Amino acid sequence: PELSDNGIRYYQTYNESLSLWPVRCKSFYISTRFGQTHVIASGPEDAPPLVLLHGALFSSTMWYPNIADWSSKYRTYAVDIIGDKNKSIPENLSGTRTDYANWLLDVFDNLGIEKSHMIGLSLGGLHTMNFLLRMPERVKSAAILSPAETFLPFHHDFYKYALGLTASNGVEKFLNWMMTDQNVLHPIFVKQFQAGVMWQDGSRNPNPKADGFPYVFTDEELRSARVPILLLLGEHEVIYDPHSALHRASSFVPDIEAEVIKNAGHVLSMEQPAYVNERVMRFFN
Numbered sequence: 340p341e342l343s344d345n346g347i348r349y350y351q352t353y354n355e356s357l358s359l360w361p362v363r364c365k366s367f368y369i370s371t372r373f374g375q376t377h378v379i380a381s382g383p384e385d386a387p388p389l390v391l392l393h394g395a396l397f398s399s400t401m402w403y404p405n406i407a408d409w410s411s412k413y414r415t416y417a418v419d420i421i422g423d424k425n426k427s428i429p430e431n432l433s434g435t436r437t438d439y440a441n442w443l444l445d446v447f448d449n450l451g452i453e454k455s456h457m458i459g460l461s462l463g464g465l466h467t468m469n470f471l472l473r474m475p476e477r478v479k480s481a482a483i484l485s486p487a488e489t490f491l492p493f494h495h496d497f498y499k500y501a502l503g504l505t506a507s508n509g510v511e512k513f514l515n516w517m518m519t520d521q522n523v524l525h526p527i528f529v530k531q532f533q534a535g536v537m538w539q540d541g542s543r544n545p546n547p548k549a550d551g552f553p554y555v556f557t558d559e560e561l562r563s564a565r566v567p568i569l570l571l572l573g574e575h576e577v578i579y580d581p582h583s584a585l586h587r588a589s590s591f592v593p594d595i596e597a598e599v600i601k602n603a604g605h606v607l608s609m610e611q612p613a614y615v616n617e618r619v620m621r622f623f624n
């Protein structure tokens with residue numbers, strides 16, 4: 340082992356956030372070609388598989404408002420995205436979109452998944468789109484929530500608030516910007532998010548490059564989608580214009596159900612869990 344003091348603190352906060360999980364779960368690691376990947380499993384072992392991919396910097400622990408509902412019907416695996424601030428441990432990771440799809444391939448294979456439902460928010464939504472485009476044979480259908488780029492490039496403010504996280508009151512600035520009411524987030528969850536931001540001496544993040552993430556799919560790439568997609572966006576979205584995003588997605592993706600949700604922004608799964616929970620279920624059913 341070799342975690343810094345800040346790393347140990349982050350791990351402790353992650354474990355404390357897992358107490359917000361209102362159903363029985365197990366934490367475990369899956370070996371992939373790009374390193375040990377942390378997974379939280381909930382739901383009946385014989386139920387259809389569902390894979391969750393969290394938003395940037397938030398980890399799999401963010402699914403606490405949704406997991407009781409989704410877990411009732413699905414064998415639900417919350418996967419920590421390799422290279423992001425969480426419990427997954429990256430090895431030899433270049434950061435290309437090919438690499439990331441192959442990482443997720445390994446996760447699927449190692450969980451014994453043939454086809455799966457997928458839900459991804461923010462960064463996880465981008466991973467989801469990248470995966471379903473490359474490997475439609477493995478995805479039954481996908482719910483893409485407030486995706487990182489994918490349809491539109493970020494507004495420049497996203498870069499600024501994300502960068503500002505480590506300086507002075509950056510965490511508070513980021514959350515007040517992104518959320519009309521950041522008090523919808525549990526204080527224990529926020530403590531973890533803060534500890535993540537303070538943990539800076541761990542794995543080095545791959546420098547953003549043209550062949551990596553974030554990414555905006557071309558017109559032709561979007562037209563090529565062969566998996567049903569539910570796209571949920573929040574009216575109060577700040578990372579881009581959510582109506583502009585819906586317009587582009589709806590213009591090109593063949594099999595899409597897209598909507599801009601009321602009284603929610605970027606982290607719509609946490610702001611409107613009652614609506615979002617049912618809406619996703621209805622789509623999968």
Ligand SMILES: O=C(O)COCCO
Pocket residue numbers: 394395396397461501502
């Ligand atoms: O979108 C988020 O939840 C945090 O992303 C900032 C990246 O450093």
